[PDB]
Each structure stands twice: as C-alpha cells, then as structure tokens.
Scaffold this active site. Sequence first.
Site, mmCIF file in Angstrom:
data_model
loop_
_atom_site.group_PDB
_atom_site.id
_atom_site.type_symbol
_atom_site.label_atom_id
_atom_site.label_comp_id
_atom_site.label_asym_id
_atom_site.label_seq_id
_atom_site.Cartn_x
_atom_site.Cartn_y
_atom_site.Cartn_z
ATOM 1 N N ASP A 145 4.383 60.284 -117.539
ATOM 2 C CA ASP A 145 5.361 60.928 -116.668
ATOM 3 C C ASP A 145 6.636 60.102 -116.556
ATOM 4 O O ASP A 145 6.674 59.123 -115.803
ATOM 5 C CB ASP A 145 4.727 61.126 -115.282
ATOM 6 C CG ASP A 145 5.661 61.776 -114.287
ATOM 7 O OD1 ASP A 145 6.677 62.333 -114.736
ATOM 8 O OD2 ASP A 145 5.359 61.746 -113.059
ATOM 9 N N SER B 287 24.093 66.469 -119.447
ATOM 10 C CA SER B 287 24.240 67.402 -120.556
ATOM 11 C C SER B 287 25.655 67.927 -120.584
ATOM 12 O O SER B 287 26.284 68.081 -119.539
ATOM 13 C CB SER B 287 23.249 68.553 -120.413
ATOM 14 O OG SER B 287 23.465 69.550 -121.382
#
Length: 330
Positions: free
Chosen positions: A35, A199
């Site tokens: 994770d 992004s």
Amino acid sequence: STGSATTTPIDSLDDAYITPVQIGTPAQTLNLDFDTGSSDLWVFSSETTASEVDGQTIYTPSKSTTAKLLSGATWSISYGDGSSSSGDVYTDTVSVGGLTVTGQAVESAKKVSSSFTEDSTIDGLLGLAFSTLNTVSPTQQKTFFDNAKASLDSPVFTADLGYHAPGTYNFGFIDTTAYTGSITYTAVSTKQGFWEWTSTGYAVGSGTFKSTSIDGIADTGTTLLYLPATVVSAYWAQVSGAKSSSSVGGYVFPCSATLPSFTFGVGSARIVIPGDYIDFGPISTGSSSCFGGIQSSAGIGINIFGDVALKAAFVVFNGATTPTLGFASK
C-alpha cells in the site's frame, strides 16, 4: 541488493493485490496488500481477537526465533475507506522477493475492523508511503522500503500491476524489459506523507486532451481512480445511461455499455487506461447495473490515482533524496 515479488489480484475484479512476504525465523509467509498510501506493516496474528479472524494466515511471534517485542509500542490506523486496525509491535526479519530487512517493525493486530475480517485473502498490509505517516507510538517506525533503501542497488521500487492478471513489485532496480518507450518522471511532494504529484490533464476516449493540473496520490492500496467531480462527470457523460447513484455510492452504468478509455497526463506524456479497466461489474449478483472504476474525489479531500490508473502503467517510486515518480506505458 534487490528484491522481486509477484503480486496477484485477490479476485476477478482486481479489488486489491496480494504479495507474499516472509516474516520471522523460520519463515512465516503471509500475503500482504502493498500500500503506497500508508506506512504501517501490520499483520493478522496469534494476538488478533479470535472472532475477528476468518481464514487469514496469522503471524505467530512466539514461533519466530528472531522476533522481539518492541516494548511499550502500540499502533492504531484508520484508512480512507473507514476500515481500521490496532495492536502492538514486534521487530523481526522480513523478506520480500529475496530482499531481506532485519529489525523490521511488524505490527501485530489485536483488533481489526469487519472489512478486514471479511477479506480472507489479505493477511495484512505493507505500507510504502513515507515513514512520517507510520502510526507506531511512542517511537515512530520505518517502512520496509525505508529500512531497505541503503542496501538497495538503487533507492527505488516499482509497481507493475496487472489487469485481471499477476504483476510485479521490484525493489532496488528498474526492469527495462517491463515497459515500452521511456519513463517520464514527475515531481513529488512529501508534505502529506504520500507519493503526491500533479497530473497535467486528461482525455476521455478519443476526445481532445484537457490541460489542467490535477494534484493527487499514487496509491496502490486504493482500488479505483478518484478525481474531481468535473473530470468524472465529463467521463461518464460519454457512457449512455450512466448516472451517479447515491444509494449505490457512486457512478453506475448499464452493463451492456462499451466504456471509453481515459487518458491522464504525466508531464508531456500520456497514460491510457483502457475502457475495460473501468468496469467493476454488477453492483450486486445478477444486476445489469455495473459499478464504475472512475469516481468523484469530492469529500475525500484528495485525488487518488489508485489501481485503475496505476495498472495501466509501469510506475517508479524513486526514493532518492528528492523523491520523484516515474510513469511508462507497457
């Protein structure tokens, strides 16, 4: 040194991935959920409330000659999905894919919430976010990657998650056979303890690319792709019949639909998520309403590039002094 381990979907929907991890001496192999959005290595154990264990493999510290109680140390974690666990702490030898760390903090669960109990395939979590998020008290502990870093050929790990198929986590090297083209690297902020990056935008299907900054985290421990409501609305508007359902808890779509792809920007590069990756199947057995793999982050407080996004790429988690993230197509 390096390590290399195969990671395997727990079910037919890729709801999560498990990777075998050797703990203790002699080795006890547990299947952990790696994770990159948390920083605790915790396991189902011989100490876990019996009624809360249902099929998981447990770590038994008393059977490990290298286990040592970390005296006074406790831990307690709550995840974004509302699940939680807590317990005490041992140090022990932990190996992943041939790579061995001695003195790793192994957090033994005394309590786990129902969603963990109900998932018989996940024996614990192995956190790969920054150690500043580790919950051990009163002495915070380091992640497996942080402990291994100095011994690694290169201070990196990579995630190569498969679509409805196994993939690979590598430590200490970049497998140049595992991706196509070049890797585009992008800046990381560690200010929140995550692999947080920005992004450069998105496209829906064959549509034009929208240049827009989307701050979010690369999180292998989250199944879906969570993005701003504007982006998500633009995506689902291209699927006839799709709608946000408050009763189901997100966007659903007719199972008869063909989903468009979703592209996200990494600098000037582009990662394309095929439409099929966005299908999470019937909301309930036999239903013709299907759950979407792109959902709104509104009210999460953060955008999450979870497995839906990451499995479309070869992803480098670069733990150099100034950390960065790399993405390649594959």
